[PDB]
Amino acid sequence: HMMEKLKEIEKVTKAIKEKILNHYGYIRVITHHDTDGLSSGGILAKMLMRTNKLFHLTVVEHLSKEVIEKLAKENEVNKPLFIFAAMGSGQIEEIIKHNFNAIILDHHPPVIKDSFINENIIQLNPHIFGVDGSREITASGVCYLVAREFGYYDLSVLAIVGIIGDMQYNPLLGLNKFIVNEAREYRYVKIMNDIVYNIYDVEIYKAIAYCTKPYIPDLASEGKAFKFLKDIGIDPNKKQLDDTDKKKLLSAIIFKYPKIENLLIDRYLIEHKVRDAFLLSEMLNAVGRNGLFAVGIGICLEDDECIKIGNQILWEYKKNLINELKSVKLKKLNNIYYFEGKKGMIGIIASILVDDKPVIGYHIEGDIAKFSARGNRDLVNRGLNLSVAMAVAKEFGGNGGGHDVASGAVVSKDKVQEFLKRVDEIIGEQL
Amino acid sequence: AHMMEKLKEIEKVTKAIKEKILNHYGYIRVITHHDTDGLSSGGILAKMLMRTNKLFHLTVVEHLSKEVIEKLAKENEVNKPLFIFAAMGSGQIEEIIKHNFNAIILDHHPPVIKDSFINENIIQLNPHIFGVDGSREITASGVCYLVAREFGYYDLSVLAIVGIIGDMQYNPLLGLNKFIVNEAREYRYVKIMNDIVYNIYDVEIYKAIAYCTKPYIPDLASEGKAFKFLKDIGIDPNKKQLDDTDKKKLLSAIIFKYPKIENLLIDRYLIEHKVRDAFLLSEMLNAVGRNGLFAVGIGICLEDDECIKIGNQILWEYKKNLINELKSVKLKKLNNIYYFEGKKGMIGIIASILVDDKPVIGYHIEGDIAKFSARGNRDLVNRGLNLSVAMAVAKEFGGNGGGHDVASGAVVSKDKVQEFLKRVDEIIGEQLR
Numbered sequence: 001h002m003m004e005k006l007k008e009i010e011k012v013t014k015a016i017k018e019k020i021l022n023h024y025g026y027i028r029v030i031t032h033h034d035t036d037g038l039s040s041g042g043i044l045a046k047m048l049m050r051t052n053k054l055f056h057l058t059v060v061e062h063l064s065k066e067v068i069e070k071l072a073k074e075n076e077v078n079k080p081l082f083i084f085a086a087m088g089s090g091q092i093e094e095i096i097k098h099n100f101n102a103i104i105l106d107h108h109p110p111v112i113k114d115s116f117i118n119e120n121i122i123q124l125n126p127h128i129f130g131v132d133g134s135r136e137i138t139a140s141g142v143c144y145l146v147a148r149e150f151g152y153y154d155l156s157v158l159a160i161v162g163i164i165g166d167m168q169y170n171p172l173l174g175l176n177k178f179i180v181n182e183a184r185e186y187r188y189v190k191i192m193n194d195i196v197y198n199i200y201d202v203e204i205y206k207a208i209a210y211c212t213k214p215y216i217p218d219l220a221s222e223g224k225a226f227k228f229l230k231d232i233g234i235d236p237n238k239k240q241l242d243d244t245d246k247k248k249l250l251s252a253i254i255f256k257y258p259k260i261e262n263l264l265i266d267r268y269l270i271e272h273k274v275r276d277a278f279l280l281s282e283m284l285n286a287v288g289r290n291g292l293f294a295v296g297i298g299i300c301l302e303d304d305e306c307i308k309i310g311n312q313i314l315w316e317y318k319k320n321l322i323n324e325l326k327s328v329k330l331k332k333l334n335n336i337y338y339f340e341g342k343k344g345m346i347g348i349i350a351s352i353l354v355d356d357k358p359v360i361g362y363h364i365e366g367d368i369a370k371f372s373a374r375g376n377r378d379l380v381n382r383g384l385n386l387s388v389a390m391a392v393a394k395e396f397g398g399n400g401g402g403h404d405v406a407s408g409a410v411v412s413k414d415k416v417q418e419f420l421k422r423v424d425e426i427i428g429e430q431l
Numbered sequence: 432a433h434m435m436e437k438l439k440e441i442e443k444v445t446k447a448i449k450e451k452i453l454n455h456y457g458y459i460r461v462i463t464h465h466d467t468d469g470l471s472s473g474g475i476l477a478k479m480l481m482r483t484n485k486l487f488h489l490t491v492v493e494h495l496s497k498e499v500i501e502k503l504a505k506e507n508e509v510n511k512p513l514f515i516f517a518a519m520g521s522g523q524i525e526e527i528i529k530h531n532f533n534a535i536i537l538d539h540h541p542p543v544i545k546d547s548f549i550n551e552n553i554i555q556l557n558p559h560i561f562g563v564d565g566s567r568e569i570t571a572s573g574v575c576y577l578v579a580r581e582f583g584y585y586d587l588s589v590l591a592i593v594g595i596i597g598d599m600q601y602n603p604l605l606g607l608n609k610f611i612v613n614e615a616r617e618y619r620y621v622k623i624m625n626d627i628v629y630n631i632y633d634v635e636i637y638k639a640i641a642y643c644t645k646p647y648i649p650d651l652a653s654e655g656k657a658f659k660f661l662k663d664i665g666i667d668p669n670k671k672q673l674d675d676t677d678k679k680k681l682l683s684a685i686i687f688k689y690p691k692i693e694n695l696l697i698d699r700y701l702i703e704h705k706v707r708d709a710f711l712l713s714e715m716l717n718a719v720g721r722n723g724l725f726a727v728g729i730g731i732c733l734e735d736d737e738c739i740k741i742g743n744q745i746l747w748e749y750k751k752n753l754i755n756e757l758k759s760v761k762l763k764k765l766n767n768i769y770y771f772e773g774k775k776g777m778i779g780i781i782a783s784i785l786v787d788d789k790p791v792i793g794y795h796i797e798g799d800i801a802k803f804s805a806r807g808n809r810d811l812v813n814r815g816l817n818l819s820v821a822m823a824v825a826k827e828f829g830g831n832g833g834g835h836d837v838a839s840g841a842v843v844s845k846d847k848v849q850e851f852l853k854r855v856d857e858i859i860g861e862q863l864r
């Protein structure tokens with residue numbers, strides 16, 4: 001039962017609370033640029049301000065050796081307390097080595113399965129308590145568990161954004177279910193079953209044209225969606241589908257595309273200026289993929305100009321993604337598919353294209369190839385573990401890891417094919 | 432026309448600052464003061480930087496000492512950040528040059544070096560360089576806002592207004608301050624309304640009166656006295672806003688207790704912020720900053736609900752405590768002045784509040800020397816009061832003193848208190864006759 005696990009986690013969250021309250025030097029917050037990472041940053045920014053802590057937040061694309069070494073040089077002068085969100089558990093040995101005063105809030109599989117690592121380091125990792133970081137909690141939800149020690153229940157809305165951004169909303173399980181229920185109880189969220197296209201608050205033909213959940217290639221243009229809606233007697237220019245319009249749209253799509261799934265979703269209407277948590281999730285993703293880290297934090301903190309930028313960037317991103325999806329050249333090996341793509345689109349396209357087999361996208365940035373591998377729950381249940389599969393990057397001079405269902409890696413740009421074959425081989429066995 | 436031509440000269444520097452920020456991709460260090468204007472400045476810069484996609488590290492310092500600067504310079508070796516100094520830097524510019532900071536100084540204090548462009552790495556935006564009086568016509572929050580408006584962030588004008596109130600430049604409203612307020616009104620971020628001061632607090636009026644220190648009316652400075660006073664004149668003491676009939680009845684009666692009833696009327700500024708009253712937001716930022724709650728104050732500027740809740744709590748504790756301190760003062764009278772011994776922290780705050788008809792001089796004895804804070808008001812100054820001259824006479828007694836006509840300080844040996852004050856009292860007597 002999760003309530004028992006939560007009593008055990010509360011021992012770590014109470015200790016983190018005290019470590020934060022009793023620290024009076026610099027505080028450094030390190031997060032990732034994904035929806036969940038940016039949401040974590042927002043939760044922590046609010047929590048720290050409310051507890052009278054000034055802080056310096058840095059967003060990194062990946063917690064590499066090199067980044068850890070650069071951060072470590074800040075320990076010489078005046079040693080900050082470091083708070084790592086969505087990272088640090090895999091890199092724990094480098095963090096012990098540099099002797100950071102650190103709090104690690106991470107849902108990726110842990111290397112050292114201890115909560116209290118030395119005198120200097122606390123690790124809150126749900127896997128340590130048998131909670132699945134791929135299905136039952138996100139980094140934002142770990143951050144929220146700390147925040148709720150101060151009674152900051154309002155920050156639950158950012159955890160919900162993280163649950164959505166990390167694809168842990170269907171089914172809603174574990175601590176994620178607890179968080180949502182706590183938000184509902186404190187009236188920070190209302191839940192409402194609805195069609196996906198209603199979240200966008202734009203003309204429906206555009207909602208349809210640019211939707212990637214589900215992605216319907218035949219309808220993935222303004223002209224084709226407009227015509228589609230015209231043909232079944234929906235006004236394509238309206239911004240919300242009513243009961244009747246929904247009935248007609250669902251029956252028409254399911255007829256023509258009987259495999260399609262998830263047209264109806266449980267919308268989360270949150271206490272935030274961006275009221276639809278699904279839209280906020282997409283917004284944060286888009287800004288994060290555009291390198292607009294501080295804007296993403298501003299959106300979490302409900303700044304009007306940051307939200308205006310977020311809307312603008314969101315729609316540019318979604319249009320660019322449809323274009324990318326149309327031109328991507330998917331290649332088959334034995335157990336996987338892969339593709340070269342643009343930085344910022346690799347992971348999302350891989351998630352969109354997964355059907356029967358893992359998909360791995362990559363992009364070249366200098367002399368190195370960066371990979372995003374995606375599976376699904378079905379594949380993991382049959383034994384997929386991309387964390388282990390992508391780890392084989394070490395044999396080719398690089399490194400990789402992440403979750404069973406989603407992992408990354410880097411290798412030398414000229415070892416692409418070698419790596420992918422070695423991963424293809426590993427994944428074959430796993431399954 | 433004249434104001435627009437002034438802004439054209441300032442735009443040369445604000446445009447360069449804008450380019451310097453946009454083009455910097457390393458760490459950004461923001462350093463500001465802990466008073467209302469410093470916290471409001473921090474808030475402006477925080478929004479401006481996030482919107483332009485810059486992460487930053489904000490620090491609040493009470494005073495930019497040589498020591499603080501040398502500590503900051505040790506961050507400089509590992510990283511080399513862009514430093515943005517608010518409400519400080521102009522006075523310390525030699526040290527900042529010495530250490531070769533990459534820096535932007537946004538400061539309304541009198542400049543040591545009267546140049547906007549210092550070298551290749553330092554920009555100083557200081558109103559005095561353009562002939563604008565930083566003590567009357569713009570605050571640090573205003574200087575930050577002049578940068579912000581180069582990005583079109585007119586909404587941040589509301590925090591500039593807060594800084595104007597906080598640094599006591601609201602009455603009269605002059606120069607760039609006046610321009611900022613008119614710009615905010617034109618873009619509908621502020622509404623202006625003449626009103627009574629008690630209406631800014633949105634609490635029961637008897638409590639607003641009880642804890643008011645602008646002005647302090649000792650005969651009304653408790654819940655019991657305020658409640659009774661309002662009951663007597665037929666005002667519901669529990670209502671939260673006085674209407675026009677209420678204000679006439681209040682002002683009619685209160686003049687017998689406090690004759691200078693013009694001090695009870697203000698132009699209220701209702702701003703586009705969760706804390707809609709700018710006078711209240713200014714008091715809230717003051718109380719949190721006095722309590723060391725600097726990050727909370729930044730949060731209030733960012734409209735965080737829990738920080739605002741903390742702010743309201745801290746405000747009202749601070750106000751109650753301040754009334755208790757005022758009630759404890761043992762005010763002594765000479766011929767032309769009042770004086771008191773108080774506590775190190777609050778002598779100047781208390782002296783300023785107590786001023787009514789005559790200058791008030793407070794002092795505390797630290798070790799062997801007595802440190803004094805002398806305050807007057809505009810009416811006294813109009814009648815010839817000049818406290819810098821009066822307080823300077825401390826040199827005759829082995830100490831030294833000076834400052835402004837309306838606000839000055841002095842130090843003398845703790846054994847020469849009576850002799851110093853007798854002299855001060857006599858000088859003031861002559862200035863006023």
Ligand SMILES: Nc1ncnc2c1ncn2-c1cc(O)c(COP(=O)(O)Oc2cc(-n3cnc4c(N)ncnc43)oc2CO)o1
Binds near residue numbers: 062108401410
């Ligand atoms: N050791 C590990 N390596 C990769 N990911 C890991 C990991 N441990 C945990 N995760 C992890 C968490 C998480 O949620 C996922 C799904 O992550 P991802 O799809 O975003 O993957 C990534 C990672 C990178 N990347 C960029 N710079 C890198 C560098 N310098 N070194 C190694 N990877 C680098 O690039 C991509 C695609 O551009 O992986």
